[PDB]
Design a binder for this molecule. Structure first.
Ligand SMILES: Nc1nc2c(ncn2[C@@H]2O[C@H](COP(=O)(O)OP(=O)(O)OP(=O)(O)O)[C@@H](O)[C@H]2O)c(=O)[nH]1
Ligand SMILES: [Mg+2]
Ligand SMILES: [Zn+2]
Lengths: 216, 223, 54, 852, 456
């Protein structure tokens, strides 16, 4: 029936390497700040366009700012202007910068930066102080040596014999952060139609210095 | 007024009529004191006349306040829309000669003290547009000369009544050109069922006694 | 021109044919802030690369 | 009780039994930086004690962050209490009242509210990021609030699966984090008895996501369980800290044999952990069965079929078991609180420990007067009625028992800020469900229904017909100052009452929120920052008041100061034309305002010590040093009031008679201020002369107070006035590359970068800078969107600074909608805030003078 | 000790004091310790150093405040109670109280009262302010006033103060604010001849959940029914206490005889056979009604010679012919038709007729302009009862005491109310803030919409 599968980690690593040319090598969703479905929903609801985002017809009949009739509240003579309130500020904080935010979605806040040191040389030890890491600039109730505490003979570290790392340790650690479906080791079978190859490509920020037609 | 009609929610601003034709900074600005004063004055006036003999209704009235907050005094009279702005207050600027502005100057010392800006009431605009619509609809099986005579009469009436206000009003000029183009299109449709291109203006604008329709123009037609 | 455009933005905020090509007039991302014009493309520690590009 | 509850390993009957014995309780507050694992740690504890509840594989359950806004945003917004019965490594059971606090620097009011009723602090530190802004501030706050602090180094798996540092370097990183914490504690606390080190038991190591938690003691216990002939206590005493193991003699030494042996910690704790994680995530199909056979872990085929992350969680859970190290730490290094009651009463209670009630409460016995203290107010889902969450410091709360609720303004003389209420029901609040009870003894946290009406922020509950000499607990002292300010209005004025009700409810909910109505009928709200205000508006618009609200653009609150003594000595006379006063104003010395604000001085001090301090430190002559009268708007304000009037010219007895009136006028004037009606900061007001009328009905009351305020205003105006701005302290955490981008963004907004350093052992950098609060708006989103999300920043109020311009200048011309250049920012701000408040267009230095 | 000798006591001006609204501090919005400044009539938080009241006193020189919850006066900044008996008027206007003798003699009062300003009036006949759209609610509230039993019950706060209510009950705001409004209306020593229903209407909108707003007028009959049911349920304390004041005063009982017509489009044989089925036979579903819903015959569609006025008319007894055992109303639900007979069984002391004036036709709503011809001072309902109950019922003559009338189009509707003032016998016509005297013989000449009749 070709319904479900369960691969091995070397297989997954080889397949990931082969598919490399179709994947953006992103480890976090911080890239998509104010560029995710929730931000787009909020922009559509508020009838505004993120610089690189889509643009729809007004969801609700837009309020004309030339209709309001200079109350005490909207008296322009009390405002203090330092920086223009761009659309991004309102999209980020919908309830503080907008009047009548309806059907507006709250956008996920920061997610802690993932600091994963991709390995470029496969000959190095799995656990290695890569030059990218900032150095640790070196510089206590200890009992005396003359003390008599003595461990029994049988006792020793739990896995002394087991090697610290093997030839497929860095590969597994990389697979931990590979994008879906390359972070799995089992699953179901999809349809060739149901697999889109460039959705991640057009969900990203457009590369700089592109023509207007491709931007649109 | 507030003792008679207490207002805890500051709701006296919800239904206030304002002259939407002017820009925001030219309209009346709704301050608490000014809004309350206008409502109080209207209430005091409406108290005098009994309900039986006749009634004064707020929805169809308009009360405008000039004070330390509002520098413009607005009103509508005889189909005009006049706005008076003092020279001392919120002018701070030199003035050239615009067509729709009257230079109200003190009569004893002969000093420019205020300026009155004029416009044509939106009601008058709508009445003229409906007059043109009636001319077109009732045109039916009538004659080109009669259509042009109706247009000339309407335009002369409007232009001789609202002399400077028409120039001051930027919407009435567009309305005039639209109606004139509609009339010309009616004549052309009567001439033939297929729209031409670059139709000559001589037929329309030539005097009647010389064989033309003697049409009166109010736009910028380039021969 | 940038300062005038910023002031314009502030003032504006406060006060049949079968076409297969989208018009350039539909384009967004035409900003005046340099921080949004040049946006410091991500360097993935110099070891990650964008998909597709050579 | 008898209500329905989820299945638990322990039993509610045993929990009720435990609450009576106040020796097996522990009031703990989980605090730390943003996104450092506190909520997931608490959830794993809940999972341990409640087998039915579980955290999803792909998604992480919280069991805090219950709110809809919390769930959507991903950031904790409100502190959450939990009550669990956790077992100790020895097998004994204790009761833990754990208040999990939010991390964002904007919600520190929640942390302060938790600390007020907590007795111990557990500080969560990420293993990769290390010490951060909020951790520093929280260490300061805890050591100042006099709590016992312990540390949990969380996310230790980032050193293995993300940085993949070698074991020795991971050990060095952990040691460095411990050193930073110890340095901060020593800085902020004079006493040196409080030293943090895993050898003592003050530090635990946790990876909450993969359910790992251990102390040297617990890991030595695992070793002893495997081989039963070792004292895990001695083993743990020897593991950490430069102790090299020697296997030929089977002994531990401070001297390294072979010059290559790893420390005992790296050998025994860290290295096998590296091995387990690497085997699970790299060789799940080749050698993991053998490794599990060695460890003794046996798991089903369906279990080992899982993906790598759930499989890691499962294997680590099977290997380690329960979070016994956390319980060991808390039990060993936190008061009882029978032991910890005495410092609590000493610091919080306003009546003093020496008081008879002070002793009766320090005893902390269930049989005694009722002295409950409520600091939190939690709203029901329907948003109609609030329940008061607090602690019981004496006696026993009973359901249906009438009580006397005292608010903050209550004093033993003005006994009108109290009210008699009737408590409806009691709850022992587990995070997501409340176990209803019928009584609660001293030394426990309690939810109370029916006492919400007469209290706004904080209150104390006692019993009527007893405790006549009862005084309130001190109101919360907050870690920051709420500065950002917004104005609010309903869209349809016919719905104003709904908006007012919502304003009252949000004022109750948010501890440090300040709602007020200005002279011009403008409803203003003060908040800490952008996210704080956004959450407040969301709650006000959706939860409490179901109407639509217009919000003005954010603005800040300024202060008023002087930069040089008054040009001339000014005076005023009472309407009676007697009782003349004459004052001068000048600026204080550097740092004196900071001392007053931070309580280095106390007007309550005996005049001897007060004069001694003022003479010795700030070079003040003793004559003036013993002439202090008041300390600004509050008892601790940044302005001082002295009197230089020599006794030869005036009668000291008469001046003492009118002292109270003059001081009240001075405090009111300082609170309001002449320039824009805002606080006056860093000013010294010296009474140079005073001619007082003889008769009490000629002086006092409505005669002196307005005159005193007018004289204060005149002196301030005569002295060269200036405005003072608030300045936020920003701390960005950006990659090593985006530092230049951060520099650009900050430079665009009058920012100033104090420093930029790397994070040792991590590939990231921290950039510390200062930014004007008014310009700070949108700064974080600007930075994130320009950097593509790789740069993140948190900002907190730091200090006040003088605005560049000169406020009282009428030459300047301000356009309505243009960003003014620097030199007249002061004038712009002054005039526009005057318009906002609704005062006159401007102020003349002779406005309050009597001559004109 | 300085009390009784306050030098500032003259500065008070009763002309500004307006105690008709919410009692919250004007600067903090808190309800706790609220003091009204008697010089300018603004609320502040109360007393003590540094409080808003104290600061306002020293700032403005307004040296006299009243504690809104304890009804005690105080002079500020130097705090001390003020004990003077000439101030009792302010306290009484702030919180009226009626003793048993006063309630008993309330009706037999023929002498006008005089407000603080030179405005004469009578208790109960007092205008109700009209915020944007209130006429219907004002009419219903005015009609519910002038009902001795309900009014006599709601004038005494202790009657309903101690009845239990659940924790989150927001329906008791209705009862307590209704009591407040009734006391304010029947206050005989007011400062103005009119009162503001703002608080009661705010509570009404809050409880009705934005139905019956104050910026849009609804149906008077719908509001009346909902309000009566709401009061009944609220007074029902933690249960449906079968007998509340509302049920005692207004609720009556009728016996409803439903006879399901066999079918319209059936043959005669089947139709008469279906009679034996007993599904189409008379039943008895005796139930209770708060108000009878009389129904008008449709307009004649053509004018006639007699009564030359185009305006049609009907006799009240012709309308009341329904609810006798003889007449049959023709109910028509989808797919089925009922011949419904009715038979009154218990007549309430205060009987409410609601004439179904408005009716929705195929394209819009229409207001049937028929005028019912009824007498005022006598109508004998004895004949509309069963002889089984005529013996039980001794008094059955009814007199009209209140009549709510709707004028204008279904869109631009307006409400007025003719009320009989007991003590005297005069009929007063009240619109929102206008009180006039109307001749008894002119009442029947209007389009009656709601009537309240008294059994005597
Ligand atoms: N790698 C790793 N990530 C973790 C660990 N524990 C928590 N996290 C992640 O850290 C983020 C913060 O989660 P929480 O613990 O719920 O946040 P918090 O501690 O309540 O902090 P606040 O949001 O300020 O309340 C989540 O995205 C978790 O997935 C851990 O042990 N290891
Ligand atoms: Mg949390
Ligand atoms: Zn006052």
């Amino acid at each position: 029936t070709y319904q479900r599968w369960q691969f091995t980690l070397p297989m997954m690593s080889t397949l990931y390497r082969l598919a490399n040319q179709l994947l953006t090598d992103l480890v976090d969703d911080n890239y998509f700040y104010l560029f995710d479905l929730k931000a787009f929903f909020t922009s559509k609801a508020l009838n505004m366009a993120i610089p690189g985002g889509p643009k729809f017809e007004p969801l609700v009949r837009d309020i004309n700012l030339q209709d309001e009739d200079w109350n005490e509240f909207n008296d322009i003579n009390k405002i203090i202007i330092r920086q223009p309130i761009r659309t991004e500020y309102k999209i980020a904080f919908p309830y503080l910068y907008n009047n009548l935010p309806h059907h507006v979605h709250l956008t996920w806040y920061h997610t802690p930066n993932v600091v994963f040191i991709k390995t470029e040389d496969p000959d190095l030890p799995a656990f290695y102080f890569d030059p990218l890491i900032n150095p640790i600039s070196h510089r206590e109730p200890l009992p005396d040596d003359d003390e008599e505490f003595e461990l029994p003979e049988f006792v020793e570290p739990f896995l002394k014999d087991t090697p610290l790392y093997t030839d497929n340790t860095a590969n597994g650690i990389a697979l931990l952060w590979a994008p879906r479906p390359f972070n799995l080791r089992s699953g179901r079978t999809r349809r060739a139609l149901d697999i889109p190859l460039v959705k991640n490509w057009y969900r990203e920020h457009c590369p700089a210095g592109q023509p207007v037609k491709v931007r649109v | 007024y507030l003792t008679e009609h207490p207002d805890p929610n500051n709701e006296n601003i919800v239904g206030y009529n304002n002259k939407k034709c002017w820009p925001r900074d030219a309209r009346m600005r709704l301050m608490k004191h000014d809004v309350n004063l206008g409502r109080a004055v209207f209430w005091d006036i409406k108290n005098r006349l009994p309900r039986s003999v006749t009634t004064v209704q707020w929805e169809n009235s308009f009360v405008s306040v000039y004070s330390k907050d509002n520098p413009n005094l607005l009103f509508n009279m005889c189909g005009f829309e006049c706005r008076i702005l003092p020279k001392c207050r919120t002018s701070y600027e030199e003035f050239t000669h615009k067509d729709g502005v009257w230079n109200l100057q003190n009569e004893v010392t002969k000093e420019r003290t205020a300026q009155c800006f004029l416009r044509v009431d939106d009601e008058s605009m709508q009445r003229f547009h409906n007059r043109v619509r009636q001319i077109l609809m009732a045109s039916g099986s009538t004659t080109f000369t009669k259509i042009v005579n109706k247009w000339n009469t309407a335009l002369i009436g409007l232009m001789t009544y609202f002399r400077e206000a028409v120039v001051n009003t930027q919407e009435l000029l567009d309305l005039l050109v639209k109606c004139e183009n509609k009339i010309q299109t009616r004549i052309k449709i009567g001439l033939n069922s297929k729209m031409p291109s670059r139709f000559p203006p001589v037929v329309f604008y030539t005097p009647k006694e010389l064989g033309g329709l003697g049409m009166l123009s109010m736009g910028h037609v380039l021969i | 021109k940038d300062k005038s455009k910023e002031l314009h933005a502030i003032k504006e905020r406060y006060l049949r044919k079968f076409v297969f090509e989208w018009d350039a007039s539909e384009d967004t991302s035409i900003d005046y802030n340099p921080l949004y014009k040049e946006r410091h493309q991500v360097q993935l520690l110099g070891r990650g690369f964008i998909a597709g590009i050579d | 009780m008898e209500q329905t509850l989820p299945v638990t390993v322990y039993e509610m009957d045993f929990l009720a039994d435990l609450m009576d014995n106040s020796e097996l309780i522990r009031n703990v507050t989980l605090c730390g930086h943003l996104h450092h694992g506190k909520t997931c740690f608490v959830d794993c504890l809940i999972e341990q004690t409640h087998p039915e509840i579980r955290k999803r594989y792909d998604q992480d359950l919280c069991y805090t962050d219950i709110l809809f806004t919390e769930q959507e945003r991903g950031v904790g917004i409100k502190s959450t209490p939990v009550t669990v019965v956790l077992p100790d490594t020895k097998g004994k059971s204790y009761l833990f009242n754990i208040m999990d606090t939010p991390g964002h620097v904007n919600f520190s009011d929640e942390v302060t509210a938790g600390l007020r009723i907590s007795d111990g602090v557990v500080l969560f530190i990420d293993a990769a990021e290390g010490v951060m802004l909020n951790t520093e501030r929280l260490i300061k706050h805890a050591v100042q609030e006099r709590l016992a602090v312990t540390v949990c180094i969380n996310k230790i798996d980032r050193l293995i699966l993300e940085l993949k540092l070698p074991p020795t370097d991971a050990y060095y990183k952990l040691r460095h984090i411990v050193d930073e914490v110890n340095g901060l504690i020593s800085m902020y606390s004079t006493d040196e008895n409080l030293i943090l080190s895993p050898l003592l038991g003050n530090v635990c190591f946790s990876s909450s996501q993969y359910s790992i938690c251990f102390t040297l003691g617990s890991f030595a216990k695992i070793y002893a369980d495997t081989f039963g002939d070792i004292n895990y206590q001695e083993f743990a005493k020897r593991l950490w800290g430069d102790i090299y193991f020697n296997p030929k003699t089977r002994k531990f030494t401070k001297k390294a044999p072979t010059s290559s042996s790893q420390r005992s910690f790296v050998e025994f704790i860290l290295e096998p952990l590296y091995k387990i994680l690497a085997q699970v995530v790299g060789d799940v199909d080749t050698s993991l069965p053998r490794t599990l056979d060695e460890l003794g872990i046996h798991l089903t085929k369906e279990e080992l079929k899982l993906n790598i992350r759930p499989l890691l969680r499962l294997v680590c859970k099977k290997f380690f078991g329960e979070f016994t190290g956390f319980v060991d730490m808390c039990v060993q290094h936190i008061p009882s609180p029978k032991v910890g009651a005495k410092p609590k009463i000493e610091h919080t209670y306003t009546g003093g420990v020496d008081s008879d009630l002070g002793e009766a409460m320090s005893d902390c016995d269930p049989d005694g007067p009722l002295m409950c203290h409520t600091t939190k107010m939690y709203s029901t889902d329907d948003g109609v009625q609030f329940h008061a969450f607090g602690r019981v410091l004496s006696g026993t709360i009973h359901a249906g028992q009438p009580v006397k609720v005292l608010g903050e303004n209550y004093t033993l003389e003005d006994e009108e800020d109290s009210q008699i209420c009737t408590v409806g029901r009691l709850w022992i609040s587990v995070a997501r469900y409340h176990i209803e009870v019928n009584r609660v003894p001293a030394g426990n946290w309690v939810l109370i229904e029916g006492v919400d009406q007469p209290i706004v922020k904080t209150a104390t509950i006692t019993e009527p017909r007893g405790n006549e000499e009862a005084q309130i607990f001190r109101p919360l002292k907050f870690n920051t100052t709420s500065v950002i300010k917004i104005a609010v209005e309903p869209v349809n004025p016919s719905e104003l009452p709904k908006m007012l009700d919502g304003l009252r409810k949000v004022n109750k909910s948010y501890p440090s929120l300040t709602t007020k109505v200005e002279e011009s009928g403008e409803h203003v709200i003060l908040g800490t920052g952008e996210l704080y205000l956004d959450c407040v508006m969301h709650d006000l618009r959706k939860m409490y008041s179901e109407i639509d609200i217009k919000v003005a653009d954010p603005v800040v609150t300024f202060c008023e100061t002087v930069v040089e003594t008054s040009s001339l000595k000014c005076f005023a006379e009472t309407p009676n034309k007697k009782n003349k006063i004459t004052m001068i104003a000048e600026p204080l010395e550097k740092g004196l305002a900071e001392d007053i604000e931070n309580e280095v001085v106390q007007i309550t001090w005996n005049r001897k010590k007060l004069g001694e301090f003022f003479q010795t430190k700030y070079d003040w002559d003793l004559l003036a040093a013993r002439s202090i009268w008041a300390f600004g708007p509050d008892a601790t304000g940044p302005n001082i009031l002295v009197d230089d009037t020599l006794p030869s010219e005036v009668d000291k007895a008469l001046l003492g008679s009118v002292k109270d009136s003059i001081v009240q006028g001075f405090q009111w004037g300082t609170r309001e201020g002449p320039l824009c009606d805002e606080l006056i900061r860093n000013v010294k007001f010296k009474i140079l002369d005073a001619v007082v009328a003889q008769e009490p009905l000629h002086r006092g009351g409505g005669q002196i107070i307005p005159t005193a305020r007018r004289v204060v205003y005149s002196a301030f105006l005569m002295a060269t006035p200036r405005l003072m701005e608030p300045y936020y302290f920003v701390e960005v955490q950006a990659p090593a590359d985006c530092v230049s981008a951060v520099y650009t963004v900050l430079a665009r907004r009058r920012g100033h970068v104090t420093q930029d350093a790397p994070i040792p052992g991590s590939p990231l950098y921290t950039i510390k800078a200062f930014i004007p609060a008014i310009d700070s708006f949108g700064f974080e989103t600007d930075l994130r969107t320009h950097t593509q999300g790789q740069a993140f920043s948190l900002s907190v109020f730091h200090h006040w600074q003088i605005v560049p311009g000169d406020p009282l200048d009428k030459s300047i011309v301000i356009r309505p909608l243009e960003p003014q250049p620097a030199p007249h920012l002061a004038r712009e701000f002054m005039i526009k805030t005057r318009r906002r408040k609704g005062l006159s267009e401007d102020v003349s230095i002779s406005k309050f003078f009597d001559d004109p | 000790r300085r009390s009784r000798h306050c030098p500032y006591l003259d500065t008070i001006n009763r002309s500004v004091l307006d105690f008709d609204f919410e009692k919250l501090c004007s600067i903090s919005l808190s309800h706790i310790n609220a003091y009204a400044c008697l010089v300018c009539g603004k609320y502040f938080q109360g007393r003590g150093l540094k409080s808003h009241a104290y600061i306002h006193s020293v700032q403005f020189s307004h040296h006299v405040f009243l504690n809104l919850h304890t009804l005690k006066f105080y002079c500020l900044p130097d705090n001390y109670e003020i004990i003077d008996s000439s101030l009792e008027d302010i306290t009484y206007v702030l919180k009226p109280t009626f003793t048993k003798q006063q309630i008993a003699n309330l009706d037999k009062q023929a002498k006008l009262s005089r407000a603080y300003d030179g405005t004469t009036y009578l208790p109960g006949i007092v205008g109700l302010n009209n915020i944007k759209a209130n006429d219907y609610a004002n009419a219903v509230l005015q009609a519910l006033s002038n009902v001795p039993p309900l009014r006599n019950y709601f004038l005494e706060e202790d009657n309903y103060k101690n009845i239990k209510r659940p924790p989150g009950d927001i329906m008791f705001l209705l009862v307590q604010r209704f009591g407040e409004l009734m006391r304010k209306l029947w206050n005989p020593r007011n400062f103005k001849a009119h009162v503001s229903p703002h608080e009661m209407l705010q509570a009404v909108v809050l409880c009705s959940k934005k139905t019956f707003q104050i910026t849009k007028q609804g149906d008077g009959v719908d509001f009346l029914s909902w309000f009566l049911n709401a009061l009944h349920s609220a007074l029902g304390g933690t249960k449906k206490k079968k007998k509340t004041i509302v049920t005692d005063v207004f609720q009556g009982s009728m016996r409803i005889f439903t006879k399901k017509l066999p079918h319209p489009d059936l043959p005669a044989e089947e139709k008469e056979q279906l009679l034996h089925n007993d599904e189409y036979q008379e039943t008895m579903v005796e139930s209770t009604f708060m108000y009878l819903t009389l129904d008008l015959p449709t307009a004649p569609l053509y004018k006639d010679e007699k009564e030359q006025l185009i305006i049609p008319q009907v006799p009240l007894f012709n309308i009341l012919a329904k609810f006798n055992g003889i007449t049959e109303k023709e109910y028509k639900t989808y797919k089925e038709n009922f011949l419904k007979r009715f038979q009154l069984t218990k007549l309430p002391p205060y009987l409410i007729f609601c004439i179904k004036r408005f009716t929705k036709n195929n394209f819009f709503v229409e207001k049937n302009p028929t005028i019912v011809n009824f007498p005022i001072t006598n109508v004998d309902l004895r004949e509309y009862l069963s002889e089984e109950v005529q013996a039980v019922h001794k008094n059955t003559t009814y007199d009209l005491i209140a009549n709510i009338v709707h004028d204008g189009k279904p869109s631009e509707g307006s409400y007025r109310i003719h009320v009989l003032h007991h003590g005297t016998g005069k009929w007063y016509e009240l619109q929102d803030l206008q009180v006039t005297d109307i001749l008894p013989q002119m009442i029947t000449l209007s389009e009656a919409y709601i009537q309240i009749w008294k059994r005597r």
